Design a protein around this ligand. Structure first.
Ligand SMILES: [Zn+2]
Ligand SMILES: [Zn+2]
Ligand SMILES: [Zn+2]
Ligand SMILES: [Zn+2]
Ligand SMILES: [Zn+2]
Ligand SMILES: [Zn+2]
Ligand SMILES: [Zn+2]
Ligand SMILES: [Zn+2]
Lengths: 447, 460, 460, 447
């Protein structure tokens, strides 16, 4: 027989810190190892590289994988859905304890490798393997892992399908059914219906926005709103700063496109930006006009900003990090005047990002925005679209994959509750064919 | 013995008065009066459909003005017995009921013509050809955007094109010997509309530099941060939910504001795009979109069917049920869960249409933030969900201006005074903070008026 | 060749089952079944008055069980055709309709006696002497707090005193050969009540140490932080608003839950204290407080007047209007803005009572967090405010237990399993987090059940 | 004639930073000078004594009184309602610019004098005068200032009535009609009705809780709830910490009373506590049992806490500051483990205070509470009653004083909006007999 087990290690009580392990008989396939970036800020300057794994488990921070000492099997892989820190962030801190390769899609593999180049001299290390969407990699005789293309607030994001002798186990945390994306190709629907007909034993999926009604707005909407705010203005020569996730890439591409269309020169600031968009351009996921400038260290940035100041803000579009009000982020540094560029009345600050619903980040962004307003700035908030799927996206996902079991992951118990109600609309039953797991719990499927 | 100091004095003219009679304590029931010394211009006369439904039965028909004034409902113009002048005109911004709803009930007491843009005028006369008073009269005058009409020698009225949740909507500029008084309730700076013309920015700048004595403007979304999304966004989202689906042949009902001609036009475009026959239900839509098509503001495929009375609707809806929902797209009223509206009674099954599991109900409208309509819409959605429907909420974009749109409006008109209208005191508070950023001062250059109040501006 | 390891095995008995049939997806409509192998004990059978009013007309009278099951309304006991045992009793926690409301409609299909505490039993028989089925029968048995009743040799039922928003309310403990199953829906640890006895802590500790196999308990306010305020707080606040006023002779109406005997007792004490004659209106109050006084749970001054039918009420209310509101204190129903309740129709003026400016309306009740009742209460308060009334909101204290009260409940009973009931999945989620702090584990030692679901505990 | 002017200097746009000036012809009476304690925390360690007035005005922080250079009169007094920092906090920083005495009720005068003993070597200084409730002090021939007793979250809090040739101008920011107080005497109602009949030209009053329905709960309610939580527990020997406003005094008195009734020894920790309750006991506003201990510096506190730890928490009730999660406050220091006393599972933390509705303090209190919960603590939140008046308290205030004009103060424009609606119920009219002022604006009353 094939006894499948699903062990919840991280992120089913919280949003960050995601880690799941799928045990097929005695083989283990681990998916995702993220940091929880909120409850690290509760403590007074931690500097995550000064701490080793255990420290951070009693903060968590990183998922408590000690519970993996109680499970009956050996891990053969560490798969990663995409390159957000809530998914690949814990790798350089925990993956070394496992004698297993790290499988990911190219952009992720690259960014992982870049992050480990800060773990220490080496680590152990695991060998890092790049697998693209649409391709499949056999890990043992009968266990084979497949990558299926999807969209998310990061480029190159993927469904993972673990084929076993008794069927496929697909895990889909962090997706979005964007039918008209700015980057990448539309999600592989035909493959989802087909693989649905092949046989899915279990579905593990995010419940982030399952309570939200309807279907997720396309990234094209964010594109159009940003177009509207940048170009559709009767105060053309003001001085505009755009801030967003350094990781989003699709949007940054939209923004530099816009800069080329609105006759400004796009300058990208911050280590964050340099890493993500740099790695993106180098690996050819985005094209850049020859005029763009990218600066990471404080000297490059501040120099670029004195320059950008005295030559005229009207003829520039700084694109940067700091949308959640991170002090030390370039925007936080501009708001505090710890920079040559010092904003004046009329100046437009464009936040192409949501406010993360945590008191820490909300306080930070509050303080940031008031400092900006006292310096006369005019703020455009939340010109943004969520990269997570809504109720209807989930509904149709259930209707094409037709999974035999469903396990909500990547969220709080309330998010999970919303998802549960939706799945119950689909014919499922709690504790029977629909399962609510907590961090540290293992659910068995038989036969 | 000595010491000095010097100040220039004079010299002296125009006593302008602004009468807040309706829609300054609440939204809707809007009425403002612009008094230029001796002469008066009435702007907007709206109905408030909110605090009439709180009472057990609405009627609104065989009732005369006074009763609705103790409900309000209609603006209390009794305070106009206290003003020193005669109204020589009644202008209307656009054809929403919070703006023209009180006309067939109050405009008759005033010996003045009603000036509006063609579509508005049309809907006005259609409403008077329905209240049935027949009547003591007014001339209904059609003035299009971009044109100007002299009414009293020194008083001249200009229409300046803008966008809003209904087609053909306009800024009104009351030119006086000492400058312009601009009234801009219900507007939005949509630079990429689906219908109509882009708002006339250049004229706004010109008129700004000519001299604006006062700006009267809505504060509905002045608290909302940033700039209002284009209607194109609503178009793209609707396009996304109707076409972008992997459960294609289900049976889909779309509900929206009957007045939002642009949105319904987008929708029939979509039905034409998805091979369903667009059918429009409700007396209300036949009213609005019928008037729109007759006057040629929207183009319609001949595939369209429009039905107003219950018999036409219930039978067309038999037509669609028995023939198959798959090749049809009903667009309807009832988005606020109005009982008696076609959708609410469909939800109650008081109709041939029997909605089934999987069916998609698409609300291209927001929930009006009032406990009544929130309750009705709650009940509606639970009936629909229990009968298995799949609900797409708030596929919608606000037709009102945000903080930054107001910012640039102030920066183009550069008015000497500012008056928030069309909202609650809190909405007005947000607007006040915004204008305070713009250099204005409360009780001096920016004024918070309440219903029934007059501020005198003495300008030379 | 070698190596070792050792584990003790066995030995083996009691298969206990817990049936969640009602009130696990919503609040109210509560029904749970405790199956001890072969025998079944039904606990609570409540009505849900929420999702019945969403439909146009309530009736509830000439309807039989099934229809109300597709509304629910009443708990779906159809799933009891699938269980392997016979119910040999029906216990009721207290006399709120979310607990005993479904009895005259479902208890008849079960060949079992209905066990309750005296006041509850009384109200039950009063309700069956009203549904009018006459009927196929059950014996209505009065078991007081602190006493125990053997029903099936190994199954014995204990009543343990507690406090709650209605007088004489009880923990139920189902003793079995292998331990106790405690059901505690609707409770509160009030250590200083105005009425009743302080909850029986010592017995809870004893029974905790004896062995509790399962705890089934409400999660209504498990999300609320801290510990529930005593009823004494509600008493002191009411004392504060009624007596503590510098506008003394106005005319004051107090509205509250008819079931909240303790609160009304406080109020009549106050009327007796402020020299007004306490008059109680509504069929509902005559029901509850009448039953309370007849059975001697509350003492009443002979000044009191209690009127149930419209004629008595409208005339007593003529009495009070024409004689002067100043020397009277009407206590009434209608706090949720129920149209047809005496207060709502007073607000509509469908009554001799004509409330005037200055008059005080005192709501000793919370707003039930549902859009329907929130809308009704909105409308009520606006009618009252427009007619000049002065409104005192939420002079109230919740009758349900908070997080910390639950904490100590777990720490006294030390149950082997925990099951949240009586709430939504989110309420249950909060409770789950609380119990997880207590050492419990989801799907192992703490179970989230939905309506219609059974968890088997196999205990030796 | 007598032309009265009311100049709004601070706190009508915000809550903190209160300052009003009443000009009677050419004489000026200033009431309140507070700090805004929120928007000082937006900046990175300010240390308010390192900055002089102007610094803080461009932060504000302290009220911008530069606008007082444009008014036609000379100030003859600086009156203070009570000893909260939103009322007397700006005195040592601005009062030196004015050649005028500072009048207050004894507890305030004391605490003011204690605060100036940190302004510098001296300052100028103004002479500080103690005037009790019920007594009157003539400041010029015809202008005389009266103190009328009321309750508020601080002991000895007062209505100020400025009698002039044309009537009284009463300012009542921060009150509460507590008819059954724990401390002090019930508000002087008879005097309010009487003085109402004498003639009030203008009423300046707080709008903090005017939107809140009904009448403010008595302090007796907070007393009873605290009694219930401290005594009504079936886990008697756990270890309980009580945190509250060091300034409240009434509640601290309740708490030590309770400690005496529940057989624990009351220990009070923090500079804040020592100052406020110490000054209170010394001036005889509260009685203390002989057993109590008060410790202010880190050494006394930490020593007391090691002591209190090893001897047994069961036999102790630490009462302290830190309810808004101030890092450096004793509770914040306990939650971070920067103290000998280190909380364990079951321990009860009792917050007898509300959460101040500002993102800064909400974030701070968030972080605090999560640290406490991770250490196993069980939290009792908001066992508290607001010290501000509600709609009905305001209503009856209007009905006994019968003021000819009303000006809401001490709040945001929305609070002011709520108050406006209530006053309109009372017959008043905006811009005519009811006035909405902003910071920096002067309103004239004639005749
Ligand atoms: Zn992600
Ligand atoms: Zn994620
Ligand atoms: Zn409109
Ligand atoms: Zn409008
Ligand atoms: Zn109950
Ligand atoms: Zn209940
Ligand atoms: Zn205060
Ligand atoms: Zn204060």
């Amino acid at each position: 027989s094939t006894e499948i087990g699903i062990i919840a290690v991280g992120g089913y009580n919280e949003m960050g810190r995601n880690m799941t392990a799928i045990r097929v008989n005695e083989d283990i396939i681990i998916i995702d190892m993220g940091i929880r970036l909120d409850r690290v800020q509760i403590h007074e300057d931690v500097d995550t590289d000064r701490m080793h794994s255990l420290e951070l488990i009693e903060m968590g921070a990183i998922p408590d994988d000690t519970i993996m000492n109680e499970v009956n099997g050996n891990v053969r892989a560490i798969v990663c859905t995409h390159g957000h820190l809530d998914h690949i962030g814990a790798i350089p801190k925990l993956a070394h304890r496992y004698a297993a390769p790290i499988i990911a899609t190219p952009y992720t593999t690259a960014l992982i490798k870049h992050q480990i180049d800060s773990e220490r001299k080496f680590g152990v290390k695991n060998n890092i393997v790049a697998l693209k969407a649409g391709e499949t990699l056999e890990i043992t005789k009968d266990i084979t892992i497949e990558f299926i293309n999807t969209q998310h607030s990061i480029i190159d994001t993927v469904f993972v399908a673990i084929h076993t002798p008794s069927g496929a186990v697909v895990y889909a945390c962090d997706f979005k059914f964007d039918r008209t994306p700015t980057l990448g190709e539309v999600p592989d629907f035909d493959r989802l219906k087909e693989l649905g007909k092949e046989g899915v034993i279990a579905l593990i999926t995010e419940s982030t926005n399952a309570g939200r009604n309807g279907k997720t707005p396309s990234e094209l909407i964010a594109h159009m709103m940003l177009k509207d705010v940048l170009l559709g203005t009767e105060e053309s020569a003001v001085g505009m700063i755009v801030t967003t996730f350094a990781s989003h890439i699709a949007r940054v591409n939209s923004i530099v496109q816009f800069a080329q269309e609105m006759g400004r020169i796009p300058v990208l600031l911050g280590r964050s930006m340099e890493r993500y968009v740099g790695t993106a351009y180098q690996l050819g996921y985005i094209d850049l006009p020859e005029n763009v400038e990218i600066y990471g260290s404080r000297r490059d940035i501040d120099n670029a900003l004195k320059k950008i100041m005295e030559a005229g803000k009207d003829k520039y579009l700084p694109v940067m990090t700091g949308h959640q009000g991170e002090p030390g982020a370039v925007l936080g540094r501009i708001a505090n005047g710890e920079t040559p560029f010092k904003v004046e009345t009329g100046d437009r600050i464009i936040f192409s990002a949501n406010v993360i619903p945590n008191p820490m980040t909300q306080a930070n962004r509050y303080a940031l925005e008031t400092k900006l307003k006292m310096k006369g700035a005019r703020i455009y908030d939340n010109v943004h679209v969520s990269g997570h799927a809504y109720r209807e996206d989930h509904w149709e996902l259930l209707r094409m994959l037709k999974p035999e079991h469903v396990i909500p992951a990547h969220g709080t118990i309330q998010m999970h509750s919303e998802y549960i109600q939706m799945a119950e609309d689909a014919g499922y039953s709690l504790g029977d064919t629909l399962h609510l797991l907590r961090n540290g719990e293992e659910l068995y499927i038989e036969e």
